[PDB]
Design an enzyme around this catalytic site. Structure first.
Site, short mmCIF file in Angstrom:
data_model
loop_
_atom_site.label_atom_id
_atom_site.label_comp_id
_atom_site.label_asym_id
_atom_site.label_seq_id
_atom_site.Cartn_x
_atom_site.Cartn_y
_atom_site.Cartn_z
N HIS A 99 -25.42 -22.61 -34.96
CA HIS A 99 -25.35 -21.31 -34.29
C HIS A 99 -23.94 -20.71 -34.29
O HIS A 99 -23.74 -19.62 -33.74
CB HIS A 99 -25.94 -21.38 -32.85
CG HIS A 99 -25.12 -22.10 -31.82
ND1 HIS A 99 -25.58 -23.24 -31.17
CD2 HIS A 99 -23.90 -21.84 -31.28
CE1 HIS A 99 -24.68 -23.63 -30.29
NE2 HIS A 99 -23.64 -22.81 -30.34
N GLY B 267 -18.03 -22.07 -24.79
CA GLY B 267 -17.12 -22.56 -25.80
C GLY B 267 -17.16 -24.05 -26.03
O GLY B 267 -16.47 -24.54 -26.94
N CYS C 74 -19.72 -25.90 -26.98
CA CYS C 74 -20.65 -26.35 -28.00
C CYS C 74 -19.89 -26.85 -29.23
O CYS C 74 -18.83 -26.33 -29.60
CB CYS C 74 -21.65 -25.22 -28.26
SG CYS C 74 -21.27 -24.09 -29.50
C1 LIG Z 1 -22.65 -22.90 -29.31
C2 LIG Z 1 -22.16 -21.44 -29.32
O1 LIG Z 1 -21.12 -21.18 -29.85
N1 LIG Z 1 -22.94 -20.37 -28.72
C3 LIG Z 1 -22.49 -19.00 -28.80
C4 LIG Z 1 -21.85 -18.34 -27.75
C5 LIG Z 1 -21.45 -17.02 -27.91
C6 LIG Z 1 -21.69 -16.35 -29.11
C7 LIG Z 1 -22.32 -17.00 -30.16
C8 LIG Z 1 -22.72 -18.33 -30.00
C9 LIG Z 1 -24.20 -20.73 -28.08
C10 LIG Z 1 -24.17 -21.22 -26.78
N2 LIG Z 1 -25.28 -21.58 -26.16
C11 LIG Z 1 -26.45 -21.49 -26.76
C12 LIG Z 1 -26.57 -21.01 -28.07
CL1 LIG Z 1 -28.18 -20.90 -28.86
C13 LIG Z 1 -25.42 -20.62 -28.75
#
Ligand SMILES: *[C@@H](*)C(=O)N(c1ccccc1)c1cncc(Cl)c1
Ligand SMILES: *[C@@H](*)C(=O)N(c1ccccc1)c1cncc(Cl)c1
Lengths: 306, 306
Positions: free
Chosen positions: A41, A143, A145
């Site tokens: 993602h 942030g 992830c």
């Molecule tokens: C993991 C990550 O970077 N996510 C984001 C946050 C903001 C913009 C794009 C992507 C994220 C966080 N939580 C869930 C998901 Cl599906 C994506």
């Protein structure tokens, strides 16, 4: 003596954390040899993470659309591929700090250390268990992830978790390091929820043994119980079944303390039926279920890692 | 979201840990630049640690009586000196992994991370608070003396604790990194005991704010209290006094949540007078006092270290 929620030393993992940026999305990656692993993602924007077709989104990308930063040093991406829910970014430099490692998938009930990261920079380390419902009760902000969970065995890091998302009850879901989610979760915007959890019985018993080793004995009693009669009580209090393999695994701790496993089950029974009556066990007023028998043996006996 | 007992990433400290051996005594040392710091009771045998005259024991020693091992690489000792309760071993090699560091002494009420070590090899990492009685509720086995406690601020490691001993109640005592003990303890065999402790009030309040930030609000109420009236209740339950500086320190957390500090005191009052009535706060059935206001802001806001 003493008993703490103790994580593995995090240094070996700190040396693998990098920042991965694609468009306005920035998250954490794991750099081992010449590959950076991160959540797929990373290639999604805000409107993208509704019903994303990740294959479509990826073919639209180039190597130069991915910026990887290892500290203040930029890593040139030379290849990219998707594997389940993770992206694999081939970079032109192998990480000289790569430890000996494995990619393992853990079972509910097992524990691991989490190195929370933001912008590729480690923030803190703590211990987590995989819940029976395949979530984890983590501590994660936006942030985070890409942060990973792991165990260490001598010199070898067994990576078992990459963080992806927070669920609506505040708990967390993610994948193993091959990109396969733990539990029935998907990396997109749905109404997905945790679903019902249970208490990890074998771990509670391990922790009662930890307490006896450390001098808390008030909850012991002369009674015993049968495995079947205990399992009747566990089901009533939403504890998972105890098996003969659980009993076998608790063998060493039983033998160190001189308390038969089924005798400790009788104690747990009384604790479930009567509460703790204003007392505490290892500094807790709740029955703790996030230490495995291995965790107890390691801490109450003293194994290191090199 | 989530809230965990979170330690600092330990890598910077892992690179400083060495094994120090003198006679049959082996413990842990801290290698910064060309000095190894360790407990002076490394020079004591079993009969020595009754009423030891450390000056006498040390003048009887030579540089070659000290073996220092950094991994599988032996460090040649070229000088030795005693400073309060620590030994300073000058070695002929400066540690190339020396981080930016400070030697600080902390206050009761403050927290730090502990990297437990055995034979110079890190075993685990966890968070501890300095108790009001200057002990720490650690997790330490035999051989752990020399393990250090620390905080990290950006890139700089502030070493605040070196472990020395276990007291009879299972709690732990040690020194700052200049060799000065925390509290009224000595590095010899006496009947020394912890002496009475109190609960760290400002930290409990910080943790209630952590809970509100994370969605636990059941313990809130419409009442308020005065600082004096709250302090009357705290003294009755063995909580330490709350000061205007404590109130000021809680300011940001108050402003983030919209809950006045004295209003949260009113909640704590009710919790002390009524218990928690079968409910939990941030997964705990006890009022937790080992998170500082800084700890809460760091975790519920998300600061990293490099
Ligand atoms: C993991 C990550 O970077 N996510 C984001 C946050 C903001 C913009 C794009 C992507 C994220 C966080 N939580 C869930 C998901 Cl599906 C994506
Ligand atoms: C710190 C240390 O190494 N101690 C020992 C243990 C065994 C032999 C010699 C020295 C130690 C542990 N706890 C208390 C004290 Cl005073 C010394």
């Amino acid at each position: 003596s003493g008993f703490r929620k103790m994580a593995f030393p995090s240094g070996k993992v700190e040396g693998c954390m990098v920042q991965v940026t694609c468009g306005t999305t920035t998250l954490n990656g794991l750099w081992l040899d010449d590959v950076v692993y991160c959540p797929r993602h990373v290639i999604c924007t805000s409107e993208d993470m509704l019903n994303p077709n990740y294959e479509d989104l990826l073919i639209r990308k180039s190597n130069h659309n991915f910026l990887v930063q290892a500290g203040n040093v930029q890593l040139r991406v030379i290849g990219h591929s998707m594997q389940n829910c993770v992206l694999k970014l081939k970079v032109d430099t192998a990480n000289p700090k790569t430890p000996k490692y494995k990619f393992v998938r853990i079972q509910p009930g097992q524990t691991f250390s989490v190195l929370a990261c933001y912008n590729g920079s480690p923030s803190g380390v703590y211990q987590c268990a995989m819940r029976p419902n395949f979530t984890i009760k983590g501590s994660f902000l936006n942030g985070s992830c890409g942060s990973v969970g792991f165990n260490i065995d001598y010199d070898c890091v067994s990576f078992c978790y990459m963080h992806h998302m927070e669920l609506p009850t505040g708990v967390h879901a993610g994948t193993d390091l091959e990109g396969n989610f733990y539990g029935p979760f998907v990396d997109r915007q749905t109404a997905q929820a945790a679903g019902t959890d249970t208490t990890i019985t074998v771990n509670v018993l391990a922790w009662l043994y930890a307490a006896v080793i450390n001098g808390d004995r008030w909850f012991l009693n002369r009674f015993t119980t049968t495995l079947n009669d205990f399992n009747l009580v566990a089901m009533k209090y939403n504890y998972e079944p105890l098996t003969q393999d659980h009993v076998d695994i608790l063998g060493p701790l039983s033998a160190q303390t001189g308390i038969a496993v089924l005798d400790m089950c009788a104690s747990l029974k009384e604790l479930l039926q009567n509460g703790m009556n204003g007392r505490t066990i290892l500094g807790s007023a709740l029955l703790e279920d996030e230490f495995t028998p291995f965790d107890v043996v390691r801490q109450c006996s003293g194994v290191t890692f090199q």
